[PDB]
């Protein structure tokens, strides 16, 4: 039965994401904040995609890094072909959805990956942060406040539901995000921001002693 | 079955990895030390990859030599395309992980291999030696002190756990590595170093009478 085989793939993909560590992304006063539980120092789950578009993922590394690379490729080819301000988080999210659907139906094994594409406004501009979550099948969801990916998402999502506050500063949003993530030191956290105040490249990692001071 | 493949392929390749000689790599004062149990004089399990990046492997010779060659190819194409100091042990390890994952899922038989990529700092520079272990599936692990590959890894890994000392000289690290490997003369040992003191090319074999003096 095709429907039973599809349930076999849906189930397969859900279990792999559960094996992966958790990631959260939430809106705060200066933009968007990515906080992931990541022990390695070389392997990363948060990345710049374009000037104002960031990316977080949770699942099999050799696949969401494949998607990371494809997305970078796409964004730069568009930006050069048209212009930088034409590439938007919405296009990127849509491409990931088409690609994960095609993979989910056509390839042997479905990517066990969960994606979050984030976008902030340009410099000196005003607009609310946009978060999109793309799941393994191709489904895409528009999130107003925060996205939680990988592992057991219920307790983290609820803790964030109680603690979230719009226009929280960088330090408060970091405390809320680490707290809800616990439901970890600088040696087990990957933290980055989409700082809306930067002139062009908004993505910026917060590591080491600066991260130490913030948390 | 999707479950059958992952569980059966895993067993077929872990068997073939335990079905082979043992190699150790450990950090010492002058860089990194590779000590392998190798009877042949033509077939080698330790190799230079790039200026400061070395490579050891355990499993099926034709396959980890295929990986050896691929890695050399990669490193030189990068070094020429960009520059020599841009190729890092981290990139190499990552490529081996992607390739062993793709092989493990797409080819008929999984590569019964276990890899260790080692890197030291450049000349007159200061930085800790980095050891990465890549397993047959694509998994990659960051090791601070030593890697043990192939055969029965438990007794060797424990003996090294008791004997290891950071900043041990070349002779002491050789004694520790041979001792823990026994848990063999110059006619059954392949010994090389990533000497951090060399100006450019750090890899250097220790064979014959010089090896005789060291051990």
């Amino acid at each position: 039965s095709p429907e039973q085989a599809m349930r076999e793939r849906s189930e397969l993909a859900r279990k792999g994401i559960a094996r992966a560590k958790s990631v959260v992304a939430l809106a705060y006063a200066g933009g968007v904040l990515f906080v992931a539980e990541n022990p390695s120092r070389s392997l990363q789950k948060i990345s710049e995609l374009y000037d104002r578009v960031g990316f977080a993922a949770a699942g099999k590394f050799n696949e969401f890094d494949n998607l990371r690379r494809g997305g970078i490729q796409f964004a730069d080819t568009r930006g050069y072909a048209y212009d930088r301000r034409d590439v938007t988080g919405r296009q990127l999210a849509n491409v990931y959805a088409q690609t994960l659907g095609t993979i989910f139906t056509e390839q042997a094994k479905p990517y066990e990956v969960e994606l979050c594409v984030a976008e902030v406004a340009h410099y000196g501009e005003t607009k609310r942060p946009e978060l999109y979550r793309i799941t393994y099948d191709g489904s895409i969801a528009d999130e107003p406040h925060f996205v939680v990916m990988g592992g057991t998402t219920e307790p983290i999502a609820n803790a964030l539901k109680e603690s979230y506050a719009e226009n929280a500063s960088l330090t408060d949003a970091l405390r809320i995000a680490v707290a809800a993530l616990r439901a970890l030191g600088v040696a087990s956290l990957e933290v980055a921001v989409l700082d809306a105040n930067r002139p062009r490249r908004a993505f910026r990692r917060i590591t080491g002693s600066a991260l130490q001071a913030l948390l | 079955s999707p479950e059958q493949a992952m569980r059966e392929r895993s067993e077929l390749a872990r068997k073939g990895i335990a079905r082979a000689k043992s190699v150790v790599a450990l950090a010492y004062a002058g860089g990194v030390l590779f000590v392998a149990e190798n009877p042949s004089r033509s077939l080698q399990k330790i190799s230079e990859l790039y200026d400061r990046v070395g490579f050891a492997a355990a499993g099926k010779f034709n396959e980890f030599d295929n990986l050896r060659r691929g890695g050399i190819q990669f490193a030189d194409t990068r070094g020429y395309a960009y520059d020599r100091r841009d190729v890092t042990g981290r990139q190499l390890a990552n490529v081996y992980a992607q390739t062993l994952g793709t092989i493990f899922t797409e080819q008929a038989k999984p590569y019964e291999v276990e890899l260790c990529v080692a890197e030291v700092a450049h000349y007159g520079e200061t930085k800790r030696p980095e050891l990465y272990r890549i397993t047959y599936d694509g998994s990659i692990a960051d090791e601070p002190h030593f890697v043990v590959m192939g055969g029965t890894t438990e007794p060797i890994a424990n003996a090294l756990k008791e004997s290891y000392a950071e900043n041990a000289s070349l002779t002491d690290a050789l004694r520790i590595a041979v001792a823990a490997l026994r848990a063999l003369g110059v006619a059954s040992l392949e010994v090389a170093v990533l000497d951090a003191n060399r100006p450019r090319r750090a890899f250097r074999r220790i064979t014959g009478s010089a090896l005789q003096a060291l051990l």
């Binding site: 094996r19 992966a20 560590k21 099999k60 066990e112 | 994952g101 899922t105 998994s139």
Partner: peptide, 5 residues
């Protein structure tokens, strides 16, 4: 393949 981040 136990490589999940």
């Amino acid at each position: 393949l136990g490589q999940y981040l």
